[PDB]
Design an enzyme around this catalytic site. Structure first.
Site, PDB file in Angstrom:
ATOM      1  N   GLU A   1     -11.863  49.900 -22.885  1.00 21.62           N
ATOM      2  CA  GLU A   1     -12.532  51.175 -22.665  1.00 21.62           C
ATOM      3  C   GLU A   1     -14.019  51.008 -22.384  1.00 21.62           C
ATOM      4  O   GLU A   1     -14.797  51.954 -22.514  1.00 21.62           O
ATOM      5  CB  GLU A   1     -12.312  52.082 -23.875  1.00 21.62           C
ATOM      6  CG  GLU A   1     -10.871  52.591 -23.976  1.00 21.62           C
ATOM      7  CD  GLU A   1     -10.593  53.336 -25.271  1.00 21.62           C
ATOM      8  OE1 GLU A   1     -10.586  52.695 -26.341  1.00 21.62           O
ATOM      9  OE2 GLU A   1     -10.376  54.565 -25.221  1.00 21.62           O
TER      10      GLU A   1
ATOM     11  N   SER B   1      -3.869  52.721 -28.679  1.00 26.92           N
ATOM     12  CA  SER B   1      -3.411  51.665 -27.773  1.00 26.92           C
ATOM     13  C   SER B   1      -2.556  52.225 -26.640  1.00 26.92           C
ATOM     14  O   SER B   1      -1.788  53.175 -26.829  1.00 26.92           O
ATOM     15  CB  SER B   1      -2.600  50.617 -28.541  1.00 26.92           C
ATOM     16  OG  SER B   1      -1.988  49.691 -27.655  1.00 26.92           O
ATOM     17  N   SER B   2      -2.696  51.639 -25.458  1.00 25.46           N
ATOM     18  CA  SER B   2      -1.924  52.082 -24.304  1.00 25.46           C
ATOM     19  C   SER B   2      -1.045  50.935 -23.812  1.00 25.46           C
ATOM     20  O   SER B   2      -0.462  51.004 -22.727  1.00 25.46           O
ATOM     21  CB  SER B   2      -2.862  52.534 -23.182  1.00 25.46           C
ATOM     22  OG  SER B   2      -3.664  51.454 -22.731  1.00 25.46           O
TER      23      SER B   2
ATOM     24  N   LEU C   1      10.200  62.635 -30.278  1.00 25.96           N
ATOM     25  CA  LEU C   1      10.429  64.068 -30.215  1.00 25.96           C
ATOM     26  C   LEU C   1      10.371  64.401 -28.737  1.00 25.96           C
ATOM     27  O   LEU C   1       9.467  63.958 -28.029  1.00 25.96           O
ATOM     28  CB  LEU C   1       9.343  64.821 -30.986  1.00 25.96           C
ATOM     29  CG  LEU C   1       9.612  65.099 -32.470  1.00 25.96           C
ATOM     30  CD1 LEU C   1      10.241  63.890 -33.135  1.00 25.96           C
ATOM     31  CD2 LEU C   1       8.309  65.477 -33.154  1.00 25.96           C
TER      32      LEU C   1
ATOM     33  N   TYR D   1      -0.680  62.375   0.470  1.00 25.99           N
ATOM     34  CA  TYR D   1      -0.735  61.972  -0.926  1.00 25.99           C
ATOM     35  C   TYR D   1      -1.615  62.818  -1.847  1.00 25.99           C
ATOM     36  O   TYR D   1      -2.793  63.044  -1.574  1.00 25.99           O
ATOM     37  CB  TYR D   1      -1.175  60.512  -1.015  1.00 25.99           C
ATOM     38  CG  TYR D   1      -1.219  59.988  -2.422  1.00 25.99           C
ATOM     39  CD1 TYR D   1      -2.433  59.722  -3.048  1.00 25.99           C
ATOM     40  CD2 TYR D   1      -0.043  59.791  -3.148  1.00 25.99           C
ATOM     41  CE1 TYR D   1      -2.480  59.275  -4.369  1.00 25.99           C
ATOM     42  CE2 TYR D   1      -0.078  59.346  -4.472  1.00 25.99           C
ATOM     43  CZ  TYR D   1      -1.301  59.092  -5.077  1.00 25.99           C
ATOM     44  OH  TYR D   1      -1.348  58.685  -6.394  1.00 25.99           O
TER      45      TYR D   1
ATOM     46  N   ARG E   1     -11.708  64.057 -32.586  1.00 25.53           N
ATOM     47  CA  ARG E   1     -10.818  64.846 -31.758  1.00 25.53           C
ATOM     48  C   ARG E   1      -9.491  64.519 -32.419  1.00 25.53           C
ATOM     49  O   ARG E   1      -9.102  63.349 -32.498  1.00 25.53           O
ATOM     50  CB  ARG E   1     -10.804  64.382 -30.302  1.00 25.53           C
ATOM     51  CG  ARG E   1     -10.064  65.366 -29.399  1.00 25.53           C
ATOM     52  CD  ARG E   1      -9.694  64.759 -28.066  1.00 25.53           C
ATOM     53  NE  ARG E   1      -8.681  63.724 -28.216  1.00 25.53           N
ATOM     54  CZ  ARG E   1      -8.407  62.822 -27.280  1.00 25.53           C
ATOM     55  NH1 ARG E   1      -9.091  62.829 -26.144  1.00 25.53           N
ATOM     56  NH2 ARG E   1      -7.460  61.910 -27.485  1.00 25.53           N
TER      57      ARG E   1
ATOM     58  N   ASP F   1      -5.502  64.795 -32.438  1.00 28.43           N
ATOM     59  CA  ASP F   1      -4.372  65.011 -31.538  1.00 28.43           C
ATOM     60  C   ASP F   1      -3.072  65.327 -32.275  1.00 28.43           C
ATOM     61  O   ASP F   1      -2.745  64.701 -33.295  1.00 28.43           O
ATOM     62  CB  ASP F   1      -4.173  63.774 -30.652  1.00 28.43           C
ATOM     63  CG  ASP F   1      -5.465  63.318 -29.973  1.00 28.43           C
ATOM     64  OD1 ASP F   1      -5.491  62.183 -29.440  1.00 28.43           O
ATOM     65  OD2 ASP F   1      -6.451  64.093 -29.966  1.00 28.43           O
TER      66      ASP F   1
ATOM     67  N   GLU G   1      -2.822  61.509 -33.963  1.00 31.45           N
ATOM     68  CA  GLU G   1      -3.949  60.590 -34.125  1.00 31.45           C
ATOM     69  C   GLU G   1      -5.306  61.286 -34.278  1.00 31.45           C
ATOM     70  O   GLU G   1      -5.495  62.432 -33.859  1.00 31.45           O
ATOM     71  CB  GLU G   1      -4.036  59.632 -32.917  1.00 31.45           C
ATOM     72  CG  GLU G   1      -2.877  58.653 -32.786  1.00 31.45           C
ATOM     73  CD  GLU G   1      -2.922  57.820 -31.506  1.00 31.45           C
ATOM     74  OE1 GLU G   1      -2.181  56.812 -31.441  1.00 31.45           O
ATOM     75  OE2 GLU G   1      -3.680  58.167 -30.569  1.00 31.45           O
TER      76      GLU G   1
ATOM     77  N   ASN H   1      -9.354  60.548 -33.471  1.00 28.98           N
ATOM     78  CA  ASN H   1     -10.266  59.695 -32.744  1.00 28.98           C
ATOM     79  C   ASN H   1     -11.669  59.912 -33.313  1.00 28.98           C
ATOM     80  O   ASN H   1     -12.256  60.976 -33.154  1.00 28.98           O
ATOM     81  CB  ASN H   1     -10.206  60.047 -31.260  1.00 28.98           C
ATOM     82  CG  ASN H   1      -8.781  60.122 -30.746  1.00 28.98           C
ATOM     83  OD1 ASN H   1      -8.081  61.114 -30.960  1.00 28.98           O
ATOM     84  ND2 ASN H   1      -8.336  59.070 -30.093  1.00 28.98           N
TER      85      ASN H   1
ATOM     86  N   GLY I   1     -14.652  61.050 -26.248  1.00 27.18           N
ATOM     87  CA  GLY I   1     -15.381  60.897 -25.006  1.00 27.18           C
ATOM     88  C   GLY I   1     -16.475  61.947 -24.905  1.00 27.18           C
ATOM     89  O   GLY I   1     -16.364  63.023 -25.493  1.00 27.18           O
TER      90      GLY I   1
END
Lengths: 319, 312
Positions: free
Chosen positions: A13, A159-160, A192, A229, A268, A270, A282, A284, A288
């Site tokens: 990040e 994590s992504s 879910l 596109y 933030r 979630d 989660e 954070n 941002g």
């Protein structure tokens, strides 16, 4: 009052962190200097830091940690780093040792909120609804109390990578093997579906003020007859289209969790909304600050202008 | 192998830290250097560090944090500090940033084990018994599900300061006022009596091995009496094993890494995991090393293994 802004970092990040720093530098209502941690772990100070910001990436720094920074010149340090060496409590601990007041969660709260397993254990113990889950450590024979489908992922919040949605137990071993290349501990969360993603900002020390609730929607890329596109997009719905009841519950849940975890400056939070049920996904500790980021946009809609948000964050660091 | 031992600290355990440092330094099977953090927070390196070690205390140091030290010279750092800036994950984080392997629990485990509130929430959820408690922050109305007697103490304070034993439900406000002088958050823990104190050592990363169980018993005051260490503790095989299993479970769930002395309270047949010490003592009188000796792990071998665990 002088503020030290720290951005970049060795994490993936890095760039989004610089983007946030840009936004903060442009509107923070206090004299502020920038310090950057290059992707190689070395630091850049002064004009070199600003130059790297302009470049949108600092692959190489000049100073190995710890940076020869005149800490005494700053009243508060604003660490705008994400993930590893950002929201995990390591930099927070360094600043504690330097005796410098800083923005955001403290050491314990940061580290805990970065651990998907331990923060859920705490939240569940406090009565906050979370997705049924189990923690698995490399080498341990997985013991999952619920049936698929479920998500397997490394225990590092946000994590992504290393994530896998599994539909059968026979596919669990492979998902775990993948997840274990990123973290020695993984969590298995009951899937879910379908679900809606809701996010809410929090401002304050331990007992905070909640912003309006926002929702994240995904629009897939496609080929249009005339426009050719069209890129996929993550749409932010502010405020989230929710009945009064649910909105109040998520806001209360966010505030309660924030309080139990002892979070200090911002966050933030979630959530997953599914089948009329809320689940805190989660927290954070370092959101941002980009003009596209959910956190500042939420508080803006909550009557808190960006400059004012930054002002309050800085002031809160001095409690 | 090159080991850097750090001892002293700003906490009230500054002197016992040096004492254990002396021991470690005399039996650690690796070339080892010593760095000392003085009570004023400034560091002492090389020659002056040794002098301070021999003086049993270092009031003031020379180098403001962070010290002008090249960490390249060491393969493993052994932070032998206790409490604040010792077991709270701050120094650990600094070391993580320097990219240096180090002995003991990481940032998360250290910070959690030093928070009497959060650590109990985790252990309770995991199924480990803990004394009944409540957490209270400055300015919020106290709600105690139990009656006195009970203790009031600052939550993230790895110290004995600000603690009170409340007998009257009317002295609570007062005890909290004191505690709040050391942490905006305090915990109220039911008082057990009669109560026995048991301690067990753990060694290893996440999945550790327990040492024999020991028991701490104090002699009559004459100035509190000597702290007797019964080892092994006089328990039936069943309780000893439960102590060990619970200690190992807590250790695992919290992800403790190199070592830990897990303390328990035994009141009328019931065990309660009291505290998890991530940086125990290493004096010849310290419980942790003595417990592992009894378990067949000599002092030198113990130190060797802790250093090696830091690398894995």
């Amino acid at each position: 009052m002088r503020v030290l802004l720290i951005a970049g970092g060795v994490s993936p990040e890095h760039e989004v962190s610089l983007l946030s720093a840009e936004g903060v530098l442009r509107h923070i209502p206090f004299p502020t200097d920038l310090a950057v941690i290059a992707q190689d772990g070395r630091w850049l100070l002064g004009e070199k830091a600003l130059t790297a910001l302009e470049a949108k990436a600092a692959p190489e720094g000049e100073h190995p940690f710890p940076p020869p920074l005149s800490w005494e010149r700053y009243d508060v340090v604003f660490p705008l780093l994400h993930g590893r060496f950002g929201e995990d409590g390591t930099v927070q601990g360094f600043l504690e040792l330097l005796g410098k007041p800083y923005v955001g969660a403290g050491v314990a709260a940061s580290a805990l909120c970065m651990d998907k397993d331990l923060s859920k254990r705490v939240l569940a113990q406090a009565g906050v609804p979370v997705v049924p889950w189990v923690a698995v450590r490399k080498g341990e024979p997985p013991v999952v109390p619920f049936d698929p489908p479920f998500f397997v992922k490394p225990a590092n919040t946000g994590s992504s990578v290393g994530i896998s949605r599994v539909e059968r137990f026979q596919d669990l071993e492979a998902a775990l093997a993948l997840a274990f290349r990123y973290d020695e501990k993984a969590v298995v969360e009951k899937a879910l579906s379908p679900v809606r993603e809701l996010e809410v900002g929090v401002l304050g020390n331990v007992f905070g003020e909640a912003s309006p609730v926002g929702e994240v929607r995904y629009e897939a890329p496609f080929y249009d007859y005339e426009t050719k596109y069209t890129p996929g997009r993550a749409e932010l719905l502010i405020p989230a289209p929710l009945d009064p009841g649910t909105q109040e519950t998520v806001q209360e849940l966010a505030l309660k969790a924030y309080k139990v975890l002892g979070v200090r400056g911002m966050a933030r939070v979630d959530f997953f909304l599914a089948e009329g049920e809320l689940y805190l996904n989660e927290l954070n500790t370092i959101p941002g600050f980009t003009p596209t980021s959910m956190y500042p946009r939420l508080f803006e809609a909550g009557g808190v202008a960006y400059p004012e948000l930054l002002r309050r964050l800085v002031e809160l660091a001095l409690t």
